[PDB]
Structure 1
Amino acid sequence: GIVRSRLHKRKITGGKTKIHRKRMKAELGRLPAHTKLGARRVSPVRARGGNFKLRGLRLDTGNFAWSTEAIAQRARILDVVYNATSNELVRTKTLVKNCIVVVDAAPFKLWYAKHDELKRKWMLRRENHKIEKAVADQLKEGRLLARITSRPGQTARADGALLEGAELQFYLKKL
C-alpha cells in the first residue's frame, strides 16, 4: 500500500531508480489521525511491535502542567489560537504537537491559593516566589495559553505544558 521509501524518488544526479522488488509490509505508511475537539473517540490499530497504538480523534481534555512549580492538573481544551504549520488547521481546531491552545485554567487558580498548621506553610511558600505579569492577568480572568507537548495522534492522550515568560511573549505578539 502506502510506503516510505527512496525507491520511487529521484537521485541526486537527477536520474531515476529502477525497481526489481515488490514493496514490503515493513515499510508502511498509514493515513493521518485527526484529533480535534468534541467527544473522545479512540480507535486502536495493531502495529508491528505486537502492540496497539491509539488514534486520538476529537480530544477535548488534556493533562496540563505549570512550569517551574513542578505540578500539573487536568483541564478542558477550549480553542486553538495558533499553529506554526498552517492557518487552515487552527480554524478546524486540530490538535497536533506545538499548537498553542486555550484551557479552562480553573484548577491552577485553586492550587495557587493553597500554595493552623497549614497557614504558616503558605507564608513560607509566598516567600522567595514570584510570577510573570502576563501570566497572572490571564490566570485571573480564567483563561491561559498553553502548548501541547505530547503527540495526540498516536497515543490518544493530549498533554501540554503552560507557557512561561520568554516563550509566551513571542506567541502573544504573533496574534
Structure 2
Amino acid sequence: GISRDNWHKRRKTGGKRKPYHKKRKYELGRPAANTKIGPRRIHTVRVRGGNKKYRALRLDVGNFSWGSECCTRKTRIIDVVYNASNNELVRTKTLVKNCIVLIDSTPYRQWYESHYALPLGRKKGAKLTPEEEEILNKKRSKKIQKKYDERKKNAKISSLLEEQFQQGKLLACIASRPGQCGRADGYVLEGKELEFYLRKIKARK
C-alpha cells in the first residue's frame, strides 16, 4: 500500500535507481487522521511490535496549561483560527500539532478568582451573583487575610490576556499530536508569541 521507503527516489546526482526488492511490511504508511471538532471518537491502531496508536478522529476537550500561572485545566476546544503549515487546515477545522485554537476561559477565571480573590473577566456594569460575591468577599481571619493581601501584590495580568478573558475565549497552541496519541494538549499563548500570532491572524483577514 502506502510506502515511505527511500529507494523510489532519485539519486543525488539526479539519475534514477532500479529497485532490488519489492515493498516490505516495515516500510508501510497509513492514511492521515484528519481530526475534527466534535463529540469524542477515537480508533485504536495495532502497530509494529504489538503496540497501540490512538487515532483520534473527533475531539472536543483537552487539558491546557497557563504557563505563567502554572495552572493546568481541562477545557473544551471551540474553533481553529490559524495554521502555519497550510490555510486549508483552518478552513476544514483540522486539529494538528502547533495549530492555534480558541478555548474556553471559565476554569482559569475560577482558579484566578479563588487564588487572588480579585475580579477578572467581569463587565464594568458590576452585576454580580451571590456565589461570586461570597467567593470574592468572604470573611477571613487576620492570618488568612494577611496571605491574601500579600498575594494581591503580584496579581497583575497583561492587557491582551485581560481582553481575551473579557471575550470569554483564550488563544492556545496544541503541543501533542492528536493522530498519534489520541488527545489534544497544549499551552495558552502569551507574551511575544501571542503578539506574533495576533499580528498573523489580523494580517490574514
Please indicate the TM-score interval, normalised by the length of the shorter structure.
over 0.9
Q: Is this contact kept in 2: 1:114–1:122, CA < 8 A?
A: no
Amino acid in the other structure paired with 2:95: L
Q: CA RMSD in A?
A: 1.4
Question: What residue is the counterpart of 1:122 in the other structure?
Answer: 148
The answer on 1:145 being equivalent to 2:171 is yes
After superposition, give the CA deviation of every residue in 1:143-169 in whole Å (9 maximum; x if it has no partner): 111111111111110011000111000
Task: Letter of the 1:23 partner, please give it.
Answer: K
Alignment correspondent of 1:136: 162
Give unpaired runs (5+ residues) of structure 2: 116-139
| Runs ≥4 residues deviating over 4 A | none
The reply on whether 1:32 has 2:32 as its aligned counterpart is yes
Question: Normalized against structure 1, the TM-score is what?
Answer: 0.94
* TM-score, reference length from structure 2: 0.81
Q: Distance in 2 between matches of 1:161 and 1:89?
A: 20
Within a 5 Å distance, the mapping from 1:58-137 to structure 2 comes to 58-115=58-115, 116=140, 118-137=144-163
- Unmatched 5+ stretches in structure 1: none
Is contact 1:135–1:165 with CA below 8 Å preserved after alignment?
A: no
Relative to its length, the structure with more helix (as a share) is 2
Higher gyration radius (CA):
2
Q: How big is the shift at 1:93?
A: 0.8
**CA distance in 1: counterparts of 2:80 and 2:46, whole angstroms:** 30
The aligned counterpart of 2:129 is none
User: In the comparison of the two structures, how many residue pairs are matched?
Assistant: 175
Q: CA deviation at 1:77?
A: 0.6
Amino acid at match of 2:70: A
Q: Equivalent residue of 1:153, what SS?
A: helix
Cα drift, residue 131 of structure 1? 1.9
